[PDB]
């Protein structure tokens, strides 16, 4: 069962799909292919919760009904920074303008 994700770190967002039976490690391998950092230099997160490499995405709480193509689930990414991992930091996107009055109920 496919889960649609946004792997985010700072101002980087990876859009990728994966199975519920696929592991957190398999997702780190996707990240290494794109962002050229090895799995041991990555930390994956669901909210502020660090995910274990051997856990399947489904075991982590990522379900098909909650990780849809049109509304993907967010997986936080933190890279190694010398002898310590950097603090998880996802930069938010820009803000839309104030809703025009001709669009208000």
């Amino acid at each position: 069962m496919d889960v649609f994700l946004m792997i985010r770190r700072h101002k980087t967002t990876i859009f990728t799909d994966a199975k519920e039976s696929s592991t957190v490690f398999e997702l780190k391998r996707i990240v290494e292919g794109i962002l050229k950092r090895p799995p041991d230099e990555q930390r994956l997160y669901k909210d502020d919760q660090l995910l274990d490499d051997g856990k399947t995405l489904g075991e982590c709480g990522f379900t098909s009904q909650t990780a849809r193509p049109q509304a993907p689930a967010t997986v936080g990414l933190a890279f190694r920074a010398d002898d310590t991992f950097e603090a998880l930091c996802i930069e938010p996107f820009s803000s839309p303008p104030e809703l025009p009055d001709v669009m208000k109920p």
Binding site: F4, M6, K11, T12, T13, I14, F15, D17, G33, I34, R68, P69, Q70, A71, P72, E91, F93, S94, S95, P96, P97, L99, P100, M103
Partner: protein, 90 residues
């Protein structure tokens, strides 16, 4: 496999090239006798993240014999999203 689409505010969006080809404009920009990166000086990140979500939705649900869900658009992003869809031709 992937392309980087950079919003006007510097956010990077890495999507499958096949998905980004959902845009007729991106498909033409990447066409011709490759370019793995596209900047959009006029599309902000709140709009470009939503366009990327639509790419995933279009590829997943096009030609599928499973019922299609609605692509959701909040009122706050609707006008800017409309302007981006019109430019991107998707």
């Amino acid at each position: 496999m992937y392309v980087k689409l950079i919003s006007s505010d510097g956010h990077e969006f890495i999507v499958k090239r096949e998905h980004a080809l959902t845009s007729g404009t991106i498909k033409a920009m990447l066409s011709g006798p490759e370019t793995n990166e596209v900047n959009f000086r006029e599309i902000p990140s709140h709009v470009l993240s939503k366009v990327c979500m639509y790419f995933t939705y279009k590829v997943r649900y096009t030609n599928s014999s499973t019922e299609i869900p609605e692509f959701p658009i909040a009122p706050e992003i609707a006008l800017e999203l409309l302007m981006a869809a019109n430019f991107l031709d998707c």
